[PDB]
Amino acid sequence: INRLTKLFQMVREAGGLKQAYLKLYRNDDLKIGTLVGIDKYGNKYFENPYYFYGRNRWIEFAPHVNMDYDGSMIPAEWYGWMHYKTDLPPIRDGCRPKYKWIADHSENLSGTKEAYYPYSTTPNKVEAWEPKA
Amino acid sequence: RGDIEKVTHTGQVFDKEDYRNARFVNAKRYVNENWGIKLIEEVPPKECTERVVFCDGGDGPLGHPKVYINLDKPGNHICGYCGLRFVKK
Amino acid sequence: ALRRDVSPLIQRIRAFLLGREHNLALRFEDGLADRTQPQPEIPDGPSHLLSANYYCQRDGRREVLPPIDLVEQQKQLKLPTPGKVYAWD
Amino acid sequence: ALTPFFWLFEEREKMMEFYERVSGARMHAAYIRPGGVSLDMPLGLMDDIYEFASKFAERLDEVEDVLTTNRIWVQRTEDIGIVTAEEALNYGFSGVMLRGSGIKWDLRKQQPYDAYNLVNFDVPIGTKGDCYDRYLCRVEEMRQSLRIIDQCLNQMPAGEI
Amino acid sequence: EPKDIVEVPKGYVYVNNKELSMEFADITDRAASTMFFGELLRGFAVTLAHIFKEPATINYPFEKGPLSPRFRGEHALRRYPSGEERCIACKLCEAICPAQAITIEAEERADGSRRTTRYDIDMTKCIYCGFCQEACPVDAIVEGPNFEFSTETHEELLYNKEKLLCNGDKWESEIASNLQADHLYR
Amino acid sequence: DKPTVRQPDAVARSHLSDFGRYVAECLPKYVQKVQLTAGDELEVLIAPEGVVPVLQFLKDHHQAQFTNLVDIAGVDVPCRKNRFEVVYNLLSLRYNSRIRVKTYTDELTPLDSACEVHKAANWYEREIWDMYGVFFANHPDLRRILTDYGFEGHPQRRDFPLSGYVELRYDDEKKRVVCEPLELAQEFRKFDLSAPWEQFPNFRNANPP
Amino acid sequence: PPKQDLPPPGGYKKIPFARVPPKSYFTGFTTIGTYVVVTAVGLGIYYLT
Amino acid sequence: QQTLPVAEVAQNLPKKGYSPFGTKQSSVAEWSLARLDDLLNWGRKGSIWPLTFGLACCAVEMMHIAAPRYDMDRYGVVFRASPRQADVIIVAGTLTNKMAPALRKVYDQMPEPRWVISMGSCANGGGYYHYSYSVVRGCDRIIPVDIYVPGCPPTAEALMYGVLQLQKKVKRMKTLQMWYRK
Amino acid sequence: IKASTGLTGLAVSTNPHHTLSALYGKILRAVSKMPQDASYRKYTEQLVKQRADSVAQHKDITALEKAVGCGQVEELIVQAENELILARKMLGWKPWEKLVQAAPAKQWDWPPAQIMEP
Ligand code: SF4
Ligand code: SF4
Ligand code: SF4
Ligand SMILES: [Zn+2]
């Protein structure tokens, strides 16, 4: 009866029908939310209590990805906030550590030249006698 | 690539002639760069005055079991669990 | 306002169909309890007392005895039924 | 029939959040242990257990409307698979199969082993021993179990786990 | 209301006990439904009513969860804030692992600290029970929040220490937050 | 006075003790021994031949009315000469009680089937034959129920290796799955979970010769 | 502020468990009576057509 | 492990594009096949039909993927019964020896192109019963496996993430583009 | 007359007083054939009298069930039909005799496999 007024609004922040369509084509949904924060890699995190619990907090993947978005691109900083483990975004909590050995996030790399492959981590135990010397 | 010949902190590496490197032609060999032996060595020792002190890993219930160390000897003393060093002067 | 629900007209229509006022199944942040809660202070046990708590009394494992032989333990010392009658009908 | 599967597995999904929230796994909690459960319930769980229970009656009514009185449902179940009472005992039957055919037997009442002593609830019984009444027993068991939670949530003491 | 064929004792509920009335007022009522699909009518009202509800679907992966801090997922070897690995090769985790999914070989390190030269978890044998993280006396091994690590090869599911250590660095921030918010219960 | 220790149910203990003796008089030919377990559960150790008689007596007698047969568990003990023991768990709805009947048999000697008394033992006996190799005479049709077709051996005997002798794999030459001698990538790592100090002194001198 | 998950002061409200049947609008006579009327009018309009 | 690009570095990277083959084909014939190869992959990617195997207690979590919370059907995934119409098989549970010939046959009857998903530890490597006398130590001993979903059971999202990996694996097949070189 | 037994597949009994009386009468005859010192003969003979007289003493089945307890009259018949089978079968087994099979050594020993020091 009055969802159009919401619908027009979604366009305005979207940037006109042209950017609205690309948003719909990408996220498969148009939703109103407040930008909670931005991670190191460009993903923008939104929140709106209007929606029900599961759909309450959502993420916009970085534009350059454009269709390779994965569930595994979420860095550990925001990971808890995104799965409702906490109600406190990383900006609003000071209990996060900043150790020097922490590593930047990475995808799950499978079927790729960058994948994992196991190997025994122990050098061989028995030494063979060398005849040459 | 570089990673194949890299030697891990545990001291293992496949010889350049060993066939087992074949597994890495289509994958990578992550060798961790944050070697614990060097990071703990970096942290300086803690000077104390009392004859015996305790280390619990630094965060009580989130650390390791509380162990007491005796500082009578000259050399700085290592904690069994965390590796931190203590010294009395 | 606070709930993303369909317009008033459809709510009446939906209410008519179900034959009963409807409570929305979907959970909303307001109904639930906050995901970051204060930390607990779980109570102790009955046997955290500091005295008169000898394990030799509290322990149950060392009190079990072997099976008792019914026929012999008389010799050394209404018809019967396995238990009490029940009306399973 | 398809819809009852989805209307109920939506509630089933909510229920396995409580498994996930206390044990850490949605299934195979590995929570109950010989000394009692392995951890205390998280703070604020019981409020959400209540919230689920308060709404679960409505969900079961809607499925009941579409299934219980459905003419087709009765025909697909009524007088199919009759279990006479004397047959059941000889077979090692138990549970709803035993109570489907009119036997008044429920281990919670006869040989109580937990707080079942401290709660009061009914037991559903069926007279015809067919699929249909056995189905009704399962639905009725879900009503009574929802009654037990009403007493557990209120009578829970504070103490060691 | 009709009567009950079998009188009911206390603490028992019957499902098919009421008999069928034979008054014309009731027979016609049953007849009308049996004759104009009356029972099925309300069944159709209910299903149509569900068209006018917000569906409960979640737009994964953009929206996902919810979970709890106790969630058991992929493994990771933590380390102290100094950077030193927490694990001291006590081997409690190996002994308790129900699936025998853990293999550890330990050796006196160069600096003389008890440490592992090997720590392998066979993720295709683990059951994600979580006994390993309960048994570790120094919280070295934890089941991290990650549950999205499906691979395209069986071999990639066998984690060695370097893989496990990498996870303990990629996921360090979130694990340290879960332990803090959960250790008191445990 | 002590909460951790479980409280014994004396009233249930009292009835089972007396009724335990009662069975001993009614069936002298078969009842070797009657004992009340520490769990306040009654066990009736019978001779191998007294299976069908004793089971019939408990099901039909007014006082017993153990109408419901719940289980038939098999236990293998290589130490004993009659290594295989068979345990029946019966339930009496009318009297609200449980009783256990145990019997012993060798690898070869058959054990009289009790399908007659309680024909709930149609499959339970089939399982016992399959798992342990105890044959049941007069069974309707004895046949493996759990293991694979043509599976050789009886897996649940203590003298059977945990992993079995043969694995399965698919062989694209033969266009079918084939069985090969077992070959495990990682052995089953034993753990020696043996305590060097006895903890339960009550059972040190138990069972005099 | 409780330090353990416990029922609130005074306890939760009673949880509905009983079965509530939906609204009934039609009886045998009203259903049979309406149909005849509807058919009769239907024939009446059919004749004019 | 290759870490993700930083925002500023990523702020310059061009938009990825849909096709994994890019629009850098030298000839018209190659380029048409590349685009035509996308059309196949778009088709097969869209509608992946599992077989409804459901062996063991992973099977329950294979129902909740079809439950309204996650709704496999949103992605074009539709359960089916006959292996002829089924395109993917989700071996979810402990494949015992007695089953093993039955899975092989059911897999064989599935028409190409067929992809297999391994759910849970049981089907991955024998899982909790790895050493049992009557368990096939992983279904890869019997049929080729294309995705391994770890867990016990895998979470519903975990399987969903697995399915999306299979879509991406399907998306990058080179069935046509490699015929040209052949 | 009970409208229904309440149990599926169990029919209401006509003249339960007669059917019980015959069955108890039959049992005492089968039991009589057993040796006097047999403990089973002493118990059922004592028992069946306690059931038999109550059947004749009471003429109202509802009163009969209270007087005997132990379930509905239909079940009372079902019970009685059994001890005929047991008593008849047991005249063949002769259980009152001495122990048929002397127990082997260590055949009921728990825990197993321990050295016994003479
Ligand atoms: S979660 Fe359980 S099964 Fe998995 S590695 Fe840890 S202890 Fe072993
Ligand atoms: S229990 Fe912890 S400290 Fe001990 S070996 Fe395992 S990971 Fe290392
Ligand atoms: S992997 Fe775990 S959840 Fe899946 S079937 Fe095996 S035991 Fe069950
Ligand atoms: Zn320390």
Enumerate the domain spans of chain H: 45-172
- Distance, first Cα to last Cα, chain C: 59
Distance from C-alpha of H57 to C-alpha of H156, rounded to nearest angstrom: 13
Q: Where are the beta strands (DSSP E) in G1-49?
A: none
Ligand 3 centre distance from Cα of residue D13 (Å): 18
What are the residues whose beta carbon lies below 5 Å from ligand 4 (ion)?
Answer: B 55, 79, 81-82
Q: F131 φ, ψ to 5°?
A: -70, -45
In chain E, residues with a C-beta closer than 8 Å to the C-beta of A84 are: 65-67
The 10 Å Cβ neighbour count of residue D77 is 17
Residues with beta carbon inside 6 Å of ligand 3?
E 127; H 56-58, 93-94, 120-122, 127-128, 152-153
Q: Which pair of tokens denotes residue C31? A: 């109904």
What is each CA distance from B47 to B51, B79, D25, E67, E111, in whole angstroms? Answer: 11, 14, 46, 45, 20
Identify which of H63, H96, H121 to mutate to test ligand 3's pocket (most ligand atoms within 8 A of the CB): H121
Q: Is the peptide bond before H113 cis (omega within 30 degrees of 0)?
A: yes
What's the gap between Cα D59 and its chain centre? 14
What is each CA distance from E149 to A107, D32, E73, H59, H158, in whole angstroms? Answer: 9, 29, 10, 20, 8
The 10 Å Cβ neighbour count of residue H124 is 30
* Count of positions (residues) in chain C: 89
Q: How many CB pairs under 8 A join D and H?
A: 26
What is each CA distance from E15 to D62, D125, D136, E60, in whole angstroms? Answer: 18, 6, 6, 42
Fold assignment, E75-185:
Alpha-Beta Plaits (3.30.70)
**Cβ-contact A50, A32 below 8 angstroms:** yes
**Cβ within 8 Å, pair C85-I75:** no
Q: Counting ligands in written order, which one lies closest to the CA of residue H124?
A: 3
Q: D73 φ, ψ to 5°?
A: -60, -40
Ligand 3 centre distance from Cα of residue H102 (Å): 19
**Cβ within 8 Å, pair C26-A52:** yes
**Cβ-contact C5, E54 below 8 angstroms:** yes
Ligand 2 centre distance from Cα of residue E140 (Å): 6
Q: Which pair of tokens denotes residue D144? A: 């009574």
What is each CA distance from H50 to A6, H79, H108, in whole angstroms? Answer: 39, 5, 15
Q: Is the peptide bond before H150 cis (omega within 30 degrees of 0)?
A: no
Distance from C-alpha of I33 to C-alpha of F89, rounded to nearest angstrom: 32
Smallest CA–CA distance from E26 into chain G, residue? G28
Using alpha carbons only, give the angle D9, D14, D18 rounded to the nearest 5 degrees: 130
Q: Which of I4, I23, I22 shows the shortest CA–CA distance to I12?
A: I4
- The contact set of F with H (CB < 8 A) is 147-149, 151, 155, 160-164, 167-170, 176-177, 184, 188
**Cβ within 8 Å, pair C67-F36:** yes
Residues 6 or more apart whose Cβ sits within 8 Å of residue D47:
C32, C33
Ligand 3 centre distance from Cα of residue H126 (Å): 9
Distance from C-alpha of F90 to C-alpha of F69, rounded to nearest angstrom: 4
DSSP state letter for C67:
P
* Bridge partner residues of E175 (DSSP): none
Does B55 belong to an annotated binding site? yes
Identify which of E127, E139, E143 to mutate to test ligand 1's pocket (most ligand atoms within 8 A of the CB): E127
Q: Is H17 left (phi over 0), alpha (psi -120 to 50) or beta?
A: left
* Alpha-carbon dihedral sign for residues F98, F101, F102, F105: negative
Distance from C-alpha of H166 to C-alpha of H49, rounded to nearest angstrom: 12
Smallest CA–CA distance from C57 into chain F, residue? F2
Residues 6 or more apart whose Cβ sits within 8 Å of residue B58:
B82, E80, E81
DSSP string computed for F27-96: -TTTEEEEEE-TTS-EEEEE-GGGHHHHHHHHHHSTTT---EEEEEEEEE-TTSSS-EEEEEEEEETTTT
Distance from C-alpha of H18 to C-alpha of H28, rounded to nearest angstrom: 19
DSSP state letter for F146:
S
**Cβ-contact E143, E121 below 8 angstroms:** no
Ligand 2 centre distance from Cα of residue A104 (Å): 26
Distance from C-alpha of C43 to C-alpha of D160, rounded to nearest angstrom: 6
Q: Is B56 left (phi over 0), alpha (psi -120 to 50) or beta?
A: alpha
What is each CA distance from H148 to A128, H116, H118, H122, I17, in whole angstroms? Answer: 40, 9, 5, 11, 71
Smallest CA–CA distance from E175 into chain A, residue? A76
The three-state secondary structure class of G48 is helix
**Cβ-contact G27, E29 below 8 angstroms:** yes
Q: Is the peptide bond before B61 cis (omega within 30 degrees of 0)?
A: no
Distance from C-alpha of H132 to C-alpha of E115, rounded to nearest angstrom: 33
Q: Whose CA is nearest to atom 8 of ligand 2?
A: E87
Residue for token pair 């009911």: E8
Please give the number of the atom of ligand 1 that sits closest to the Cα of E96: 7
Walk across the sheet containing E114-122 and list its strands. Answer: E102-108, E114-122, E158-159
**Cβ within 8 Å, pair C20-G3:** no
Q: Counting ligands in written order, which one lies closest to the CA of residue B53?
A: 4
Looking at 3.40.50.12780, 3.40.50.12280, 3.90.1150.10, 3.20.20.370, the CATH number of the domain H45-172 comes to 3.40.50.12280
- C-to-N gaps above 2.5 Å in chain C, after residues: 77
Identify which of H94, H96, H155 to mutate to test ligand 3's pocket (most ligand atoms within 8 A of the CB): H94
Q: Which of E91, C69, A67 shows the shortest CA–CA distance to F35?
A: C69
DSSP string computed for D96-144: HHHHHTT----HHHHS--SGGGG-----EE-SS-SHHHHHHHHHHHHHH
Q: Does residue E185 sit at the C interface (CB-CB below 8 Å)?
A: yes
**Cβ-contact I40, F26 below 8 angstroms:** yes
**Cβ within 8 Å, pair H164-A71:** yes
Q: A37 φ, ψ to 5°?
A: -175, 180
- Are chains I and C touching, using the cut-off of 8 Å on CB pairs and a minimum of 3 such pairs? yes
Q: Which pair of tokens denotes residue H177? A: 């583009």
Cα atoms found within 13 Å of the Cα of residue F50, Cβ hemisphere only: 31
**Cβ within 8 Å, pair I70-C85:** yes
* Bridge partner residues of E142 (DSSP): E76
Q: Which pair of tokens denotes residue E37? A: 């699909």
E164 pocket-lining for ligand 2 (C-beta < 6 Å): no
Cα atoms found within 13 Å of the Cα of residue E119, Cβ hemisphere only: 28
Walk across the sheet containing A57-60 and list its strands. Answer: A34-38, A44-47, A57-60
Residue D30's Cβ-count burial label (10 Å; 0-12, 13-18, 19+) is middle
DSSP state letter for H178:
H
Greatest Cα pair distance in chain I? 71
- Bridge-based pairing state of the strands F136-137 and F84-92: unpaired
Chain E residues 1-60 within an 8 A CB cutoff of chain I: 5-6
Stated as kind and residue range, the H or E segment containing D91 is none
In chain A, residues with a C-beta closer than 8 Å to the C-beta of C8 are: 1
Residues 6 or more apart whose Cβ sits within 8 Å of residue D77:
D130, D131, D132, D135
In chain C, residues with a C-beta closer than 8 Å to the C-beta of F4 are: 46-47, 58-60
Chain F residues 147-166 within an 8 A CB cutoff of chain I: none
Q: Does residue I104 sit at the F interface (CB-CB below 8 Å)?
A: yes
Using alpha carbons only, give the angle A78, A79, A81 rounded to the nearest 5 degrees: 65
State which approach was used to obtain the coordinates: cryo-EM
Question: What is the residue type of H116?
Answer: V
Distance from C-alpha of D144 to C-alpha of D137, rounded to nearest angstrom: 10
